[PDB]
Structure 1
Amino acid sequence: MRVTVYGFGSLNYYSNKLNVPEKLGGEPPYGGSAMAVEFAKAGHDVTLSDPNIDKVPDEIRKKVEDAGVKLTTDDIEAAKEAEVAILFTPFRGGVTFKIAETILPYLVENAVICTTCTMSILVLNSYLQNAIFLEGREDIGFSTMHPAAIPGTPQHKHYLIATNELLRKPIVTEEQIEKLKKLATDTGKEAYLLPAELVSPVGDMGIVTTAIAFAGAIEYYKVSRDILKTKRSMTEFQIAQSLQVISSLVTKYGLEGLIKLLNVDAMKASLQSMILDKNEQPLTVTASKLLEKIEETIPELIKEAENFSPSEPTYTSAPSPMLVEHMEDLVGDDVLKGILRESWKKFNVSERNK
C-alpha cells in the first residue's frame, strides 16, 4: 500500500536530550524515520516528507533511502498517492493542524489520516470539520498509529489504533482500520484497537499515571474484596471518587493546589490504617514509603503549595459522565464539543501559573 509518514523525528532529542540508545535501546534514526523504514522493509511503497531532510546526516539518510523510503520536503506532493498519512509531527502549536489541512484535498479517495502521540485524533478530526465540508472529503478517515514507544527501540512492538468505540459519530471505516492493522502486523507489531479517546491516556507519556492509578485501583479492590469484605458498589464509588477528585484538583488548581488541598501529612497518616496485608499490597507499601520523603524530592512544588490559595470554589468530586449526560440533554453535543476543544489547548490557567 502507499503510506506517507510526515516527520523524520528529532535527531537531537533522541540522541542528546533523551539518551534513547542508553535508556531504551536500538540505534538512530528513531521516530517517523524508523516507522518508514519498517513499512518499506515489509514491502509497502513508502514516502517520508519532512521540510528538514537536508539537515539529516548523509549516512543516516542513505540508510533510510536504502530501505526503499522515498524522501521529500513537499508535503502536498507526498499526499498525492497516500492511502495512509501518518502525522509524526511536532508537539509545537499549529504545525500538525497546518499539515493536515494542507494535504486534505490531495489524499486519495478513502485515505485515512493518523495522528501519533503529539495530537489527539479527536481534536484533529473536530478542527477539520469545516475543511472537510468545503473540500467534500467526507470519505477521509481519522485514526491513529500511536507507537506508545519510540520507533527504533526494542520496546516498540505494537501500535495503538483508534476505533469508533465510545464515539457518537464514526470517524473511520472498517476498511481503513484493516489497513492500519495490516501496517502493524506486516511489520511484526501487535495491533491494539482502542476507543479513540483512550489512545492518548494509554499511549502517551501519561501511561505512568494511567497504569499506576489503574494498578492501585485493582490493589484497593483486592483489599476491599478479601480483607475489608465491603460491597463492590462501595469499592467502585471510592475508586471513582478518589481519581475524579485528584483529576479535578490538578485541572483547576495545578499540582501545587493538589498538594496543598489534599494534605500529604493527612494522606500519609490515613494510609497507615489501610496497610492490612503487606505481602498483598506492593503499591500501598511502596506509595507509603514515597510519601515519607516526598518533600525532599519536589521542593519546588512544596514551595508553590505553601504560597497557594484557591481563587474560587468547585465541586472536585462531580462525576464527569453524569455532568456530560445532563449537558448533552440540556444543550446537545455540538454545544458540549466546544468544551473538549478548550481542554486539549492546555496541553490559559497553566500559562498564568495557576
Structure 2
Amino acid sequence: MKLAILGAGCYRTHAASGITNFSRACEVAEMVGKPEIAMTHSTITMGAELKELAGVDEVVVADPVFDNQFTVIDDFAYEDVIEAHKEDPEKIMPQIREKVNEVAKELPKPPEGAIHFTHPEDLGFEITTDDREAVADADFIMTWFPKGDMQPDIINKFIDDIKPGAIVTHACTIPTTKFYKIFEQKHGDLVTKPETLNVTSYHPGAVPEMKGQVYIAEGYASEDAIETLFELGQKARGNAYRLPAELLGPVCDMCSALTAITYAGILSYRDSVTQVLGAPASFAQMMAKESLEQITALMEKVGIDKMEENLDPGALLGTADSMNFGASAEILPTVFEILEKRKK
C-alpha cells in the first residue's frame, strides 16, 4: 500500500491553543522504538502510525511548503518529551509553546511556512511539492487542506492522476458531501467503467499527536474501502469509529457535548418506553421525532438566547416526572436540577 499525504500541517495553531500535547505521538514512539515520532504532529503522526503500526509500506508527503520555509525546530530532545509525557506533559509543553509562538511571529503561515520538530524524511517518507506525483499509484490519499472552498482548485490539479478505486479522505474543513461532489463523475458520452473513487475520512479528534482515535465517514465509499480504513485505523490510531458522514460535524470537539447529551437522552427515553412501558420502539420514535423537531424549530424561530422567554424551563418539570423510570431515571435527576434552577 502507498499512502500519499497531501498537507503536512503546521504546529502553530496547536501551540497557540495552549491545550495540546504529544501524548499519543510519544506512546507510538515508545511502541515502535523510534523516538523522533514523539514530536510529530498532524498528518505526520498519522503517517508514522500507519507506516510503523499498520504495515503501510510507502508514504509520500506533498506540500508546497517544502520548497518554501519548512521549519524544523530542534531545541527539544525527543527523549525529554517522551519522559515528560510519562507523568506530566506540562513539565515541557510551556517551553515548547513559547518557542513555537516566537517562531510563528515572523514565520509565514502555510503554505509559505510550517513548523515541525521532526522532518518527515527522517521517518522514511518521500517528500515532494507536486501533488500530482504524490498521488500517482497511491492507494490511500490523505488530504489535509484548508477551508473547503479552496479545495476544488487544489484537487482538480491532480484528480485525473488518482488511481481508480483509491481511498481519498478529507479534512474537517469541508463536509464529506461537498468533498464528494468534487470527485463525483455523473454523465458521460462513452460507456466505459467509471473510475470510481472511495471518498471517506480519517479524521482524528483533538490533534492526533495528542489523542488516538479516528473517525471514518460512511456514505461515499464502498463497504470494502470503509472496512479497510477502519482496520488500518484500529491498528494505527488505536481505535476507530465508522459513522454516517453527516455526523462528523456533530461529533467534533466543538459540538460533541450537545450531540452526546441529546443522544443519551434519546437512547434513555427509548429504553424506558420499550423496556418498562412495553411499547414498540416506533412509538418512542414518533414521540421523539416531534419533540426533537419542535425544540429545534423553537430555537431557530426565537434564537437560542431567547428560548426560556418562550418555553419556561419550569413548564417541563411536572410532566417530565411521568416518565421517570427505567433508563431515563438515570439522566432525569440532573435535568430536573438544571430546569428547576432555570425556571421562571
Task: State the TM-score, normalizing by the size of structure 2.
Answer: 0.67
Other-structure match for 1:323: none
Q: Give, as a single letter, the amino acid of the residue that structure 2 aligns with 1:15.
A: A
Q: Is the 8 A contact 1:11 1:29 kept in 2?
A: no
Distance 1:281 1:189, change over 3 A: same
Count of residues in Structure 1 that have an aligned counterpart in Structure 2: 285
1:288 offset after TM fit, Å?
A: 2.8
The alignment partner of 1:94 has SS state of helix
Determine if the alignment matches structure 1 residue 57 to structure 2 residue 69: no
- What is the identity, as a one-letter code, of the residue corresponding to 1:242? S
Shift of the 226–161 alpha-carbon distance from structure 1 to 2, 3 Å rule, reads: closer
Aligned-residue offset at 1:76? 3.0
Percent identity over paired residues: 24
2:313 aligned residue (236, 239, 264): 264
Gap regions ≥5 residues in structure 2: 27-37, 75-115
Superposed CA deviations along residues 274-301 of structure 1, whole A, max 9, x for unmatched, are: 4735996232222233345569xxxxxx
Aligned-partner SS, 1:21? coil
- The structural deviation recorded for 1:14 is 1.8
> 1:71–1:215: structure 2 CA closer, same or farther, 3 Å change rule?
same
1:125-168 C-alpha deviation (Å, 9 max, x unpaired): 1244369969x9633221222334531224x23x333344xxxx
Alignment partner of 1:87 is 2:143: yes
What's the offset of the Cα at 1:104?
Answer: 0.5
CA RMSD of aligned residues (A): 3.8
Corresponding residue for residue 235 of structure 1? 284
Is 1:2–2:2 an aligned residue pair?
yes
When residues 252 and 18 of structure 1 are mapped into structure 2, their CA distance, relative to the original with a 3 A threshold, is: farther
Structure 2 Cα separation of the partners of residues 95 and 84 of structure 1: 21
Q: Kindly provide the amino acid, as one letter, of the partner of residue 125 in structure 2.
A: V
Task: With a CA cutoff of 8 Å and minimum separation of 6, indicate the structure with the bigger relative contact order.
Answer: 2
Change (3 A) 1:21 1:190: closer
Output aligned runs, 1:284-303, within 5 Å: 284-293=332-341
By how many angstroms is 1:216 displaced? 1.0
- Picking from 122, 127, 131, the partner of 1:71 is 127
**TM-aligned CA distance change 1:271 to 1:206, over 3 Å:** farther
Aligned to 2:265, the other structure's residue is in SS state: helix
Separation in structure 2 between the aligned mates of residue 187 and residue 4 of structure 1, nearest angstrom: 16
CA distance in 1, matches of 2:226, 2:281: 36
Q: Distance in 1 between matches of 2:221 and 2:275?
A: 43
- Matching of residues 110-121 of structure 1 within 5 Å: 110-121=165-176
Structure 1 residues 274, 127: CA separation in 2 closer, same or farther (over 3 Å shift)? Answer: farther
How far apart in 2 are the matches of 1:47 and 1:39?
Answer: 12
Distance 1:182 1:276 in 2: 41
How far did residue 19 of structure 1 move?
A: 0.9
Shift of 1:47: 1.8
Aligned match of 1:246: 295
User: Which of the residues 202, 216, 225 maps onto 1:161?
Assistant: 216
Q: Which residue of 1 aligns with 2:112?
A: none
The alignment's TM-score, normalised by the length of structure 1, stands at 0.65
Segments of 5+ residues of structure 1 without an aligned counterpart are: 165-170, 296-354
Offset at residue 175 of structure 1 (A) = 4.9
1:36 matched to 2:12? The reply is no
**Secondary structure of 2:124 counterpart:** coil
